[PDB]
Every structure is written in C-alpha cells, then in structure tokens.
C-alpha cells in the first residue's frame, strides 16, 4: 500500500500530489523553503498573505491552496511551525499541526505528500524528534505515500 520514503534533493520537485510548506502566521515567506514556495506559487502566497492579515492562519490548522497545475502537485499545504518569524518553533506546534495535516489529507483524498523537516534549522527543533512524529503521523495513513526530506 502506502510507503514512507526518505526524500532527497529539492522538495519542490517531488512527484507527489501535495507538497508541505512551513510557515509563520504573520504573512512572510522570506527565507528557506518558504521563500522557494513563494517564488514558485505567487498566487498561493498572495492568498496566504491575505489570510494572515485577517488572522485566519494559526498554529494547529493547515492553510491549504490548490495549485491548478495539470502537471505536478495539486495542493500546497502550508503548515504553521511558528507564530511570529522572530520566535522559534516548538514541538507542541508540530503535534497540533500534524493532527490537522492528517485530517486534511483524508478530507481531500490526497494519495501522496512530500514533507520537509518541519521546524528544524529555522525553527531550532531536533530532527530526530520531528522525524519520530512525522513517521507516527503517517502510520495513521497506511494508503498514503509520504516522502520525508531530512535536513539539507
Ligand atoms: Cl490512508
């Protein structure tokens, strides 16, 4: 059925139905993988920025956008790993987000997703901690292919 695999190279070139991006709640995708997502999906960013100004993006809730692309990823799942970008990430934010990430994958019937190392580096979390949680979460989706990208 579904496999959890070790990703490498550029997450944005993953051959999956969804891509996960790591975001803050204040409307700024200024460095790291979020910057790359902004450059590739400018309409997605504009929607995210509007939602942030209105207070609609919060810890524990995915902000999901459709790409509308005939080829490649259909959904961008923006996973909040931080409140303000000034502040670090926390394991509790990852726990809460994963709950909604699973819910969203089920609800949208996503067959495959690529996931970055949520809150590691930029957010200051330990990889091994986050990797455990990611693997645990995707074991609840036995028919989904999950490609997990370690710190690069
Ligand atoms: Cl499943």
Author numbering: -1 to 150
Question: Which sentences from the paper describe this structure?
Answer:
The toxin of the system (DarT) is a domain of unknown function (DUF) 4433, and the antitoxin (DarG) a macrodomain protein. We demonstrate that DarT is an enzyme that specifically modifies thymidines on single-stranded DNA in a sequence-specific manner by a nucleotide-type modification called ADP-ribosylation. We also show that this modification can be removed by DarG. The DarG macrodomain adopts a typical macrodomain fold composed of a six-stranded mixed β sheet sandwiched between four α helices and one 310-helical element.
To get a better understanding of the antitoxin function, we determined the high-resolution X-ray crystal structures of the Taq and Mtb DarG macrodomains (TaqDarG-macro and MtbDarG-macro) in a ligand-free or ADPr-bound form. TaqDarG-macro and MtbDarG-macro share the same overall structure with an RMSD (root-mean-square deviation) of 0.89 Å over 149 α-carbons and a 56.4% sequence identity. Similarly, TARG1 and apo-MtbDarG-macro display an RMSD of 1.68 Å over 128 α-carbons with a sequence identity of 23%. Importantly, we confirmed that the Mtb DarTG proteins exhibit DNA ADP-ribosyltransferase and hydrolase activities toward the same substrates as the Taq proteins. Moreover, the genetic screens in Mtb indicate that the macrodomain ortholog (Rv0060) is an essential gene in this organism, whereas the toxin component (Rv0059) is dispensable (Griffin et al., 2011, Sassetti et al., 2003). The fact that DarG is essential in Mtb (Griffin et al., 2011, Sassetti et al., 2003), combined with our data and solved structures, should facilitate efforts to design specific small-molecule inhibitors against this enzyme.
